[PDB]
Amino acid sequence: PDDVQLVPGARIANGRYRLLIFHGGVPPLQFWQALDTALDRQVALTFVDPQGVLPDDVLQETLSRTLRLSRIDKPGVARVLDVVHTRAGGLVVAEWIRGGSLQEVADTSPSPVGAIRAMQSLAAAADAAHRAGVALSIDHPSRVRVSIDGDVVLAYPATMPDANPQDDIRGIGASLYALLVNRWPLPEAGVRSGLAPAERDTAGQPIEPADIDRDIPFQISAVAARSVQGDGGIRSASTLLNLMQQATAV
Amino acid sequence: LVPGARIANGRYRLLIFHGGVPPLQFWQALDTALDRQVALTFVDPQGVLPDDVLQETLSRTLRLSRIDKPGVARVLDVVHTRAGGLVVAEWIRGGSLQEVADTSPSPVGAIRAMQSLAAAADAAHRAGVALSIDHPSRVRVSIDGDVVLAYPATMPDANPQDDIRGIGASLYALLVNRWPLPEAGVRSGLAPAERDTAGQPIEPADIDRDIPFQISAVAARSVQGDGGIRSASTLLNLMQQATA
Numbered sequence: 001p002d003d004v005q006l007v008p009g010a011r012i013a014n015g016r017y018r019l020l021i022f023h024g025g026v027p028p029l030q031f032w033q034a035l036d037t038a039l040d041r042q043v044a045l046t047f048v049d050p051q052g053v054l055p056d057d058v059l060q061e062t063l064s065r066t067l068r069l070s071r072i073d074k075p076g077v078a079r080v081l082d083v084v085h086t087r088a089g090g091l092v093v094a095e096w097i098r099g100g101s102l103q104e105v106a107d108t109s110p111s112p113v114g115a116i117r118a119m120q121s122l123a124a125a126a127d128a129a130h131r132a133g134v135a136l137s138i139d140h141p142s143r144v145r146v147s148i149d150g151d152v153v154l155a156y157p158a159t160m161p162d163a164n165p166q167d168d169i170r171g172i173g174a175s176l177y178a179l180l181v182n183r184w185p186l187p188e189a190g191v192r193s194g195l196a197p198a199e200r201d202t203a204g205q206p207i208e209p210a211d212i213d214r215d216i217p218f219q220i221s222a223v224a225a226r227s228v229q230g231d232g233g234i235r236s237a238s239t240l241l242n243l244m245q246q247a248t249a250v
Numbered sequence: 251l252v253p254g255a256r257i258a259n260g261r262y263r264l265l266i267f268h269g270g271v272p273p274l275q276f277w278q279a280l281d282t283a284l285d286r287q288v289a290l291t292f293v294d295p296q297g298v299l300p301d302d303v304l305q306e307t308l309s310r311t312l313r314l315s316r317i318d319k320p321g322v323a324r325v326l327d328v329v330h331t332r333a334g335g336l337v338v339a340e341w342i343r344g345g346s347l348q349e350v351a352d353t354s355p356s357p358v359g360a361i362r363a364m365q366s367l368a369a370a371a372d373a374a375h376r377a378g379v380a381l382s383i384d385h386p387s388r389v390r391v392s393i394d395g396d397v398v399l400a401y402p403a404t405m406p407d408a409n410p411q412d413d414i415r416g417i418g419a420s421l422y423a424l425l426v427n428r429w430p431l432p433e434a435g436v437r438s439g440l441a442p443a444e445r446d447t448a449g450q451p452i453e454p455a456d457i458d459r460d461i462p463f464q465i466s467a468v469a470a471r472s473v474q475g476d477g478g479i480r481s482a483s484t485l486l487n488l489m490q491q492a493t494a
Binding site: 095 | 281285312315326327340
């Protein structure tokens with residue numbers, strides 16, 4: 001074979017990373033848990049176009065934009081350890097976050113207040129990213145993990161040319177929604193996350209978190225709704241974090 | 251090894267020399283692939299080491315890297331290059347120990363910052379590995395206010411008790427801006443501590459009387475091999491009680 005096929009146990013990038021577990025993804029992206037054979041420690045891998053179907057310009061712009069993301073040190077985004085050109089595609093290597101996927105954590109029905117607190121890191125991270133002029137691209141539940149320390153983190157950074165800052169704001173709200181309601185408010189692509197789509201009202205808008213479970217405080221619900229909505233009116237990650245903090249304070 | 255040199259297939263570009271304990275060399279470099287700074291420790295650039303000493307250094311360093319603590323910089327790579335054994339770590343934004351020591355920081359801020367390094371030493375010693383804080387340039391002070399080992403490489407000489415002395419020496423430097431231990435290696439960038447009649451470093455509180463005795467004592471008792479603190483766990487506990 002030209003390129004090493006991706007299966008658990010296989011090694012890629014000059015035999016440096018050993019694949020362990022496939023966590024999903026949205027083509028042309030694959031999220032993997034792997035083992036670095038140089039350091040004997042686990043890393044997150046994001047394969048960009050393993051099959052090399054993309055126009056070269058789109059691949060290069062994804063790696064370059066993701067590199068801009070490599071300068072950001074925040075709890076809310078996995079530290080980028082490296083970005084490599086492979087055989088066909090490219091590879092983003094990040095630190096591994098001990099924890100569980102957004103889906104796994106959402107399924108344990110966390111405290112609404114613990115949820116909103118945990119989300120704050122993701123907003124702060126996105127905001128750092130936007131100031132560096134790059135999106136975090138939270139496009140999908142599988143991008144996200146929650147650390148043992150209670151930080152929501154983008155686990156599998158790759159930023160493709162089409163991703164934009166405003167959709168991160170919606171992604172963050174969607175993730176907050178997932179933790180509150182155990183449902184995903186936004187259209188979902190690629191491999192199924194395990195999150196059942198949210199219930200929608202007559203207008204096709206996701207029903208607010210409190211209207212689902214009333215035990216959830218009124219600002220915590222509002223933050224989620226205004227954030228997920230396209231017209232919701234929260235135009236910056238900095239503003240979103242502040243709103244989150246102001247809701248937690250209550 | 252000089253500024254501008256290219257290391258590991260051109261990937262890293264040397265910026266600034268931070269000294270070291272020979273054969274080890276600490277370098278601040280540019281990672282030209284990711285366009286970010288990294289910390290580089292060259293284990294034996296001139297190949298004076300017996301292979302077994304090189305291998306042990308790499309092995310113990312790998313052992314150290316699996317400790318996940320704020321007190322040690324993340325190791326990016328450990329690789330045998332054309333320049334010899336090389337340990338690549340993330341860059342800690344901050345200033346060097348020497349730089350911060352020169353600003354005469356709060357004694358309370360200094361001991362607080364030193365906690366992360368002591369906690370890391372404790373964790374590492376439990377794992378059977380030493381930090382090797384042998385030299386002022388080993389550690390940097392992060393913007394977040396933690397003292398962090400910035401240039402991990404652990405040679406066979408490194409041991410838990412010397413870590414304790416190196417950590418105490420570092421705190422000493424922060425308090426009085428002097429190095430309490432006999433000069434080690436090259437480019438330490440610190441004047442020697444003033445010594446008493448027995449040839450021992452003068453306790454910080456005696457040099458500067460605003461240094462609370464407890465804070466002063468942690469430093470003095472860590473540094474002296476006579477009667478001192480024998481564990482990192484105990485060292486950390488003393489640091490915490492002092493700031494309490």
